[PDB]
Amino acid sequence: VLVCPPLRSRAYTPPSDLQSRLESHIKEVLGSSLPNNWQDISLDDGHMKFRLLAGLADGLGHAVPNSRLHQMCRVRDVLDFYNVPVQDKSKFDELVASNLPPNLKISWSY
Amino acid sequence: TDRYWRVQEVLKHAQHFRGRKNRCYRLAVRAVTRAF
Amino acid sequence: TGRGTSSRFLTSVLHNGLGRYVQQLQRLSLSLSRDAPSSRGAREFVEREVTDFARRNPGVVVYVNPRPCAMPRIVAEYLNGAVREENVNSKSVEEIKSLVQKLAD
Amino acid sequence: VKKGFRAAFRFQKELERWRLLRCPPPPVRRSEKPNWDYHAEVQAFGSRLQETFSLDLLKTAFINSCYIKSEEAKRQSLKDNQELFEQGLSFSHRCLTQFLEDEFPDLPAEGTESLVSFLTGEAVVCHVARNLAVEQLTLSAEFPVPLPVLRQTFFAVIGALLQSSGPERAALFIRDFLITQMTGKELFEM
Amino acid sequence: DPVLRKCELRIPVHRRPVQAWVESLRGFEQERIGLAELHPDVFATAPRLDIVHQVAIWQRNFRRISYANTKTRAEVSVAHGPRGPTSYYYMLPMKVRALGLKVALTVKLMQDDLHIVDSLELPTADPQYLTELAQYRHWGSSVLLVDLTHEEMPKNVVAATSGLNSFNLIPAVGLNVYSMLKHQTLVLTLPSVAFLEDKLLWQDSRYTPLYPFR
Amino acid sequence: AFVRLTLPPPKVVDRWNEKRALFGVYDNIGILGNFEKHPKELIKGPVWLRGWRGNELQRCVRKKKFVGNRMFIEDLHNLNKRISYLYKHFNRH
RNA sequence: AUUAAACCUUGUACCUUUUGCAUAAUGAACUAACUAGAAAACUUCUAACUAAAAGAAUUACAGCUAGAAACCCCGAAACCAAAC
């Protein structure tokens, strides 16, 4: 009765309306609704951090790495962490879509 | 396990020699160095 | 060694430079491996310098075939029929770039 | 018995080298052999010459009557280069004669014919084409390409070049590549 | 209800605690159920890989015994050939060995190769479920499962891990650098982390042992 | 010399077999077991060199003492003669 | 070198050993395999910990623990015991 879900891609692209989704999650926080020093709000609270990060990851689709977890002391890097894109395209894939000249031939034998 | 190739290295330069010198590694090596 | 080695006289392929200079090299073939220490320098070369060479010299056909391979190798074919193969086993990016430029000349 | 797999593999390469020397493989055209792209080679061929060619016309010039028969024979189990061939040969005769006359107006017409015939000889055309890799780019049903078929393509390409680049560029091409062959050639030799 | 764990020992004031995502194997999507704290002096040690290199050599070469032998001229009815059974056993300092294990833990965590789990219990013993879950969670080809004690390890996990060549299950006392390096990713239970920390953190002070602890 | 005209049979090695995969497990018995059992106690081999190492003369001497009562007369005499030659070289030269 | 295999031009076999010299003297018909440097007491270097160090026996007013680092081959005349 246990069926494995399909593997999900590791590529995450920042939403165009990142602030709108971001402030929506900040509103999800208990009464914050973009308060004073919103970017400087401390995340040291375990329960608040879990709720905020968990909700953001599900909606935005990007999750804080365990190794990078402790750097997420305040919001400022949370917004920065989500706004930096992540691409699953391989180097060969990027090279393929790089206006290859007519005399250059690439074949993937793997 | 590559001693044959070592002999071949001397032989390639000694193929044009005449007599037992061209086929004896003891003599072929000496001639090759002298030629160089 | 000269007595045991051949020699020739000065000559040109077909008087290449009388009207216009023609590049002898016509085709380049490259074999690479996804995971191989020997190909690390070649791996980076494809990332950075392969495109620049192709733009600089668009008249040479370049074949790049990443494949499971023990030793990466480069094969160069010339118009007159000369074909030369160079092993790229454990060679740096700078070494590779210089070699290709020498082959073209 | 000497142990190891590397040593045994090394001897196999030694055997192959001896086998290659003893029994050289039969010649085959690069077209049949792998890692051949006709379109890429033609583009590289045109770029290398620094000349503009109409890809459709150039392919027709390379196409030969013999090549079509093989495809038709395979089909049983496409445009010839004759039209282009005539233009290049006919134009070359006038252009080649023009070169001789300008330098040597005193030289008789009969002499120019001998010079033109030698410069347009099958061996002379074949030598230039083979050294130019044209044989690999030639389309034919037989390898090595027969000389008369090879000669047809050479002038056929000239006809295509005339349309693509005009007579002026072709004349420079003829001077740069064909008139060069007369260097060191004495009058009675030709 | 998030599962929140704190270090039992006093964390240094100048060092902030290390944290990681607590996971469960009950379901495919039960990747995150709580957040746990890790002692910086254990999971945030300096990356001294030479100690790990030395430990690997010690591990392989302390058990090494060579049985090669050859007879000398006096023993013939090799001038410098092997002579009888030879041993290469040697002992590294206790403090260094403990440090090497600590360094390995940091490498896996910093490299996102360590997965902290509340318990190893599985809904089914089918090996297919375990492998598929590893694929879902992007685990490595080889996954190492560690439990506090061998006797109490769940029956369901034993059947799956026993039948999997690349997924190996070991007890906490059996943990070693070689297995961690050999296995792409490490799965550690919450009690095991506490068990490991105590011994590693206990190493503080010397009070040199006047006699073996056996 | 002349070399094989055929390749040796292919060998396939499993790097994740139980022996290789589980090699070294419990090597931390001392630290993870409260030091009740020293890792030297995990050495398997000849009795006279379990938890001990030395040069060949020391190894041979220790072997003689450990199983001298169980050693064959021919073996014991041969070992004594070999030790005599070894003793002079190490202790006089 | 050469158009050209030989001609013209240049050049006193090898190892060892004698003086750092052989026109001395030793050894070599050739082919294939086999055929000769081996130890850690202390030091330097690489690290662990530090008035302490070492998983018992050791050393210490910066020491202590671990690791790495080394010293050939063949050949007598003889001498003795026990059999034949």
- Return the closest-CA partner of residue E84 out of F54, C70, C11: F54
Q: Could you tell me if residue D167 is left (phi over 0), alpha (psi between -120 and 50 degrees) or otherwise beta?
A: alpha
The residue written with tokens 């609704």 in the block is A33
The residue written with tokens 């910086």 in the block is E40
Our measurement of the distance from residue E85's CA atom to the centroid of its chain's CA atoms, rounded to an integer in Å, reads: 32
Interchain proximity D47–A105, CB inside 8 Å: no
Distance CA D34, CA C75 (A): 13
Residue F31, nucleotide of least CA–C1' distance: G55
Q: Give residues with Cβ within 8 angstroms of F75, minimum separation 6.
A: none
The rounded radius of gyration (Å) of the Cα atoms in chain D is: 22
Our measurement of the distance from residue C30's CA atom to the centroid of its chain's CA atoms, rounded to an integer in Å, reads: 9
Amino acid at F21: A
Q: Map residue A49 onto helix, strand or coil.
A: helix
Interchain proximity A102–D37, CB inside 8 Å: no
Closest Cβ opposite residue C23 in set D48, D173, D176: D48
The secondary structure of chain E, three-state, reads: CCEEECCCCCCCCCCCCEEEEEECCCCCCCCCCEEEEECHHHHCCCCCHHHHHHHHHHHHHHCCEECCCCCCHHHCCCCCCCCCCEECCCCCCHHHHHHHHHHHHHHHHHCCCEEEECCCCCCCCCHHHHHHHHHHCCCCCCEEEEECCCCCCCHHHHHHHHCCCCEEEEEHHHCCHHHHHHCCEEEEEHHHHHHHHHHHHHCCCCCCCCCCCC
Question: DSSP class of residue A4?
Answer: P
Enumerate the β-bridge partners of residue A74. A42
The residue written with tokens 């009562």 in the block is F69
State both tokens at B35. 């030629």
Q: Compare all CA atoms of chain F with the CA of B3 and give the residue at the minimum distance.
A: F1
What is the resolution of the experimental data for this entry, in Å? 5.7
Listed in sequence order, the DSSP H helices in A1-110 are 18-28, 46-60, 75-83, 91-96
- Return the closest-CA partner of residue E56 out of E180, E144, E141, E167: E180
The residue written with tokens 């041969």 in the block is F78
The yes-or-no reply on F/E contact (3 CB pairs or more, < 8 Å) is yes
Q: Map residue A105 onto helix, strand or coil.
A: strand
State both tokens at C101. 């430029």
Distance CA D178, CA E162 (A): 79
Q: Compare all CA atoms of chain B with the CA of C4 and give the residue at the minimum distance.
A: B16
The yes-or-no reply on E/A contact (3 CB pairs or more, < 8 Å) is yes
Distance CA D165, CA D57 (A): 12
The residue written with tokens 């006699």 in the block is E211
Distance CA D174, CA D132 (A): 14
The residue written with tokens 């879950």 in the block is E133
- Return the closest-CA partner of residue A4 out of E143, E167, E25: E25
Q: Tell whether C85 is within 8 A of chain A (Cβ).
A: no
Q: Map residue D181 onto helix, strand or coil.
A: helix
In contact, D86 and D158? CB cutoff 8 Å:
no
Our measurement of the distance from residue A86's CA atom to the centroid of its chain's CA atoms, rounded to an integer in Å, reads: 7
Distance CA D159, CA D174 (A): 12
The rounded radius of gyration (Å) of the Cα atoms in chain E is: 21
**Chain B residue numbers touching D2 (CB-CB < 8 A):** 1
Residue E211, nucleotide of least CA–C1' distance: G56
The residue written with tokens 């254990």 in the block is E42
The residue written with tokens 């004669």 in the block is D97
Distance CA C73, CA C92 (A): 14
- Return the closest-CA partner of residue D132 out of D93, D158, D113, D111: D158
Question: DSSP class of residue D26?
Answer: P
Distance CA E122, CA E111 (A): 26
Q: How far is CA A39 from CA A25, C26, D187, F49, in A?
A: 13, 60, 92, 67
Instruction: Give the CA count within 13 Å in the CB-facing half-sphere of E145.
Output: 27
Give residues 2 to 21 of D whose Cβ lies within 8 Å of B. 2, 4, 6-7, 10
The residue written with tokens 């070469």 in the block is E61
Listed in sequence order, the DSSP H helices in B1-36 are 3-14, 25-35
Residue A71: count other Cβ atoms within 10 Å of its Cβ. Answer: 12
Distance CA C62, CA B11 (A): 39
Residue E108: count other Cβ atoms within 10 Å of its Cβ. Answer: 21
Distance CA F77, CA F60 (A): 13
Q: Give residues with Cβ within 8 angstroms of F87, minimum separation 6.
A: F57
Angle between helices A46-60 and A18-28 (to 10 degrees): 140
Amino acid at C1: T
Closest Cβ opposite residue A110 in set C34, C51, C61: C34
| F89 C-beta less than 7 Å away from strand G | yes
Question: DSSP class of residue A12?
Answer: B
State both tokens at E52. 């790990």
State both tokens at C5. 């080695």
**Chain E residue numbers touching A67 (CB-CB < 8 A):** 109-112
H or E segment and range at residue C64: strand C61-66
What are chain F's partners, defined as 3 or more CB pairs within 8 angstroms? B, D, E
Amino acid at D54: S
Å separating the CA of residue C1 from the C1' of nucleotide G52: 72
- Return the closest-CA partner of residue E59 out of D52, D162, F22: F22
Distance CA E138, CA F79 (A): 61
The residue written with tokens 């040593």 in the block is D7
Distance CA F42, CA F29 (A): 9
Enumerate the β-bridge partners of residue C29. C63, C75
Output the CA torsion sign for F62, F65, F66, F67. Answer: positive
Q: Tell whether A110 is within 8 A of chain C (Cβ).
A: yes
| C7 C-beta less than 7 Å away from strand G | yes
The residue written with tokens 């590694």 in the block is B25
- The burial class, CB within 10 Å (0-12 / 13-18 / 19+), for E42 is buried
The yes-or-no reply on A/C contact (3 CB pairs or more, < 8 Å) is yes
CA distance C74 to chain D (A): 13
Output the CA torsion sign for D85, D91, D94, D98. Answer: negative
Q: Give residues with Cβ within 8 angstroms of E11, minimum separation 6.
A: E17, E37, E39, E40, E41
In contact, E6 and E38? CB cutoff 8 Å:
no
Phi (first) and psi of residue A105, to 5 degrees? -115, 130
Q: Map residue A58 onto helix, strand or coil.
A: helix
Distance CA A84, CA A107 (A): 32
State both tokens at D135. 């044989």
Residue E96, nucleotide of least CA–C1' distance: G48
Question: DSSP class of residue C75?
Answer: E
Tallying the residues shown for chain E, one arrives at 214
For residues A18, A22, A24, A30, the Cα torsion angle rounded to the nearest 10 degrees is 180
Write down which residues 4-63 in F have CB closer than 7 A to strand G: 29-31, 35-39, 55
In contact, E168 and E144? CB cutoff 8 Å:
yes
Q: Tell whether C64 is within 8 A of chain A (Cβ).
A: yes
Covered bases, chain G (protein CB within 7 Å) = 1-2, 6, 13-14, 30-33, 35-40, 46-49, 52-57, 65-68, 72-74
Closest Cβ opposite residue D47 in set C14, C59, C79: C59
Q: How much of chain C is helix, strand and coil, in % rounded to 5?
A: 35, 25, 40
Q: Give residues with Cβ within 8 angstroms of A40, minimum separation 6.
A: A74, A75, A76
In contact, C5 and B12? CB cutoff 8 Å:
no
**Chain C residue numbers touching A100 (CB-CB < 8 A):** 54
Distance CA E204, CA E197 (A): 12
In contact, D185 and D124? CB cutoff 8 Å:
no
Q: How far is CA E143 from CA C8, C75, D68, E187, in A?
A: 66, 42, 62, 7
DSSP D57-93: HHHHHH--HHHHHHHHHHHH----SHHHHHHHHHHHH
Q: How far is CA C43 from CA A97, C31, D66, E38, in A?
A: 18, 10, 45, 39
Residue D133: count other Cβ atoms within 10 Å of its Cβ. Answer: 21
| E137 C-beta less than 7 Å away from strand G | no
- Return the closest-CA partner of residue E196 out of E38, E82, E30: E38
Closest Cβ opposite residue D44 in set C15, C26, C80: C26
Q: Tell whether F1 is within 8 A of chain D (Cβ).
A: yes
Q: Compare all CA atoms of chain C with the CA of D173 and give the residue at the minimum distance.
A: C19
Distance CA C24, CA C78 (A): 5
Question: DSSP class of residue A6?
Answer: P
CB under 8 A, 24+ apart: contacts of E67-73: none
- Return the closest-CA partner of residue E21 out of E5, E1, E10, E9: E5
**Chain C residue numbers touching A95 (CB-CB < 8 A):** 46-47
How large is the greatest C-alpha to C-alpha distance in chain E, in angstroms? 81
Distance CA E26, CA E120 (A): 8
Q: Give residues with Cβ within 8 angstroms of F73, minimum separation 6.
A: none
Count Cβ–Cβ pairs < 8 Å, chain A vs chain C: 40
- The burial class, CB within 10 Å (0-12 / 13-18 / 19+), for D92 is buried
Burial profile E171-196: b = 16 or more Cβ within 10 angstroms, e = fewer: bbbbbbbbbbbbbbbbbbbbebbebb
E-strand ranges in F19-90 read none
The residue written with tokens 């379901």 in the block is E27
Write down which residues 1-36 in B have CB closer than 7 A to strand G: 3, 7, 20, 23-26, 30
Q: Compare all CA atoms of chain F with the CA of B5 and give the residue at the minimum distance.
A: F1
Residue C94: count other Cβ atoms within 10 Å of its Cβ. Answer: 11
What are chain D's partners, defined as 3 or more CB pairs within 8 angstroms? A, B, C, F
DSSP C42-105: HHHHHHHHHHHHHHH-TTSEEEEEE---SS-EEEEEETTS-EEEEE-TT--HHHHHHHHHHHH-
Question: DSSP class of residue A69?
Answer: T
Peptide bond into F8 cis (omega under 30): no
Output the CA torsion sign for D158, D159, D162, D168. Answer: positive
The residue written with tokens 């015939």 in the block is D117
What are chain C's partners, defined as 3 or more CB pairs within 8 angstroms? A, B, D
Count Cβ–Cβ pairs < 8 Å, chain B vs chain F: 4
In contact, B25 and B7? CB cutoff 8 Å:
yes
In contact, F59 and E84? CB cutoff 8 Å:
yes
Distance CA D158, CA D180 (A): 17
Q: How far is CA E96 from CA D122, E49, E174, E191, in A?
A: 84, 12, 18, 24
Q: Give residues with Cβ within 8 angstroms of A69, minimum separation 6.
A: E18, E19, E20, E21
What are chain E's partners, defined as 3 or more CB pairs within 8 angstroms? A, F
Q: How far is CA C14 from CA C22, C76, D145, in A?
A: 10, 20, 21
Amino acid at E186: L
- Return the closest-CA partner of residue C22 out of D49, D99, F21: D49
In contact, D149 and D64? CB cutoff 8 Å:
yes
Amino acid at E184: Q
Distance CA A12, CA A60 (A): 8
Of the residues E65, E101, E103, E188, the best mutation for testing chain F's interface (the one with the most F CB atoms within 10 Å of its CB) is E65
Q: How far is CA C60 from CA A18, C25, D43, in A?
A: 47, 7, 10
Angle ∠(A82,A84,A85) on CA atoms, nearest 5? 100
